[PDB]
Amino acid sequence: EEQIAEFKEAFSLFDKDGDGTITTKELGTVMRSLGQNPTEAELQDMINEVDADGNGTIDFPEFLTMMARKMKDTDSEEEIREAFRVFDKDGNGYISAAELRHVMTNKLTDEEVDEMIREADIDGDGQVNYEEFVQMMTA
């Protein structure tokens, strides 16, 4: 879109010397300005994860690919978090059988919805948390 412009700006914040590549040391600089203090090994891992051609640095195409996947994955997370908030009527961080039942009609019996909860209820507390919800929605 015109989001490439925004991605170029973000890239330019990493590419401190404007050579069109992001090095481990430039990434290091960025992360310390955000209040993190990564090791050289941690930095290398992060570069390696994005470095499609294995040349040891991140060019703008590599960065753009990474940003587009991160944005899709961020958009998805947010969609699932919104769905979860809709179910979690009382905002307690768990979906009850009662909340699932309400939502699910808008006609299931307590027994039928208990069954749905149990299927999703990895930790056995008889409710569905966000982590369990993500599992159920993405599997």
Partner: peptide, 15 residues
């Protein structure tokens, strides 16, 4: 039924 949830979410989202 998770399908039904995915579909109705897709239709009634961002209200």
């Amino acid at each position: 039924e998770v399908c039904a949830i995915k579909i109705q979410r897709a239709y009634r989202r961002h209200l």
